[PDB]
Design a protein around this ligand. Structure first.
Ligand SMILES: *C/C=C(C)/C=C/C=C(C)/C=C/C1=C(C)CCCC1(C)C
Ligand SMILES: [Cl-]
Length: 206
């Protein structure tokens, strides 16, 4: 099982999700979430964007993907919760800090990269606070079914997103403990669940 095989698997999974969401069509956002990831995985499957950094290999399309798709996931959750256009700005700003810090830390060869990782971790804790607190208060004002859908997507999001920084740190970008193949396999699984699984839970409730 090679890296390219794993990338193709993620590509296929994102494509199936993309077509499913487009057919059922919120729906436009889900198409963007999995559609963008599909492209990133194909590019990586073709061997494009594999950037050598010191002694590790960094996958640049992954971070462009995350920077564009994760704010769309937060946007989807913000619509469910009924956020005013100002609350959107805070959470999307916090999200972008996490994503940019990870992208920069991955691309820096020296230990300064752990300083960038730490900053993303701090901003992530602030993002979790807004999901579990203010956004949950806001979602409470909606129908019982909308509130229930928000809570289920929120917990899926919070629990799984919290695993990514550990995979990053244990993988090549960090202490380089986990091997690239295992690290990639774990992230392909998480990407598929936080995007396509996310989407199908929304379809089921609709
Ligand atoms: C579809 C892709 C998803 C949902 C990716 C999520 C990624 C994260 C939640 C990553 C978080 C990180 C930290 C909290 C600190 C810095 C390193 C990151 C980017 C792995
Ligand atoms: Cl990476």
């Amino acid at each position: 099982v090679g890296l390219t095989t794993l990338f193709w698997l993620g590509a296929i999974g994102m494509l199936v999700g993309t077509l499913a969401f487009a057919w059922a069509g919120y729906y436009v956002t889900l198409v963007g979430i999995s559609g963008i990831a599909a492209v990133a995985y194909v590019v990586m499957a073709l061997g494009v964007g594999w950037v050598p950094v010191a002694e590790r290999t960094v996958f640049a399309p992954r971070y462009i993907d995350w920077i564009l798709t994760t704010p769309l996931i937060v946007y989807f959750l913000g619509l469910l919760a009924g956020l005013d256009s100002r609350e959107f700005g805070i959470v999307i700003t916090l999200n972008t800090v996490v994503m940019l810090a990870g992208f920069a830390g991955a691309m820096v060869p020296g230990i300064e990269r752990y300083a960038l990782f730490g900053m993303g971790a701090v901003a992530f804790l602030g993002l979790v606070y807004y999901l579990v607190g203010p956004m949950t208060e806001s979602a409470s004002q909606r129908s019982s079914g909308i509130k229930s859908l928000y809570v289920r997507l929120r917990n899926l999001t919070v629990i799984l997103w919290a695993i990514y920084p550990f995979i990053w740190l244990l993988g090549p970008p960090g202490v380089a403990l986990l091997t690239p193949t295992v690290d990639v396999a774990l992230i392909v699984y998480l990407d598929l669940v936080t995007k396509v699984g996310f989407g199908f839970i929304a379809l089921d409730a609709a």
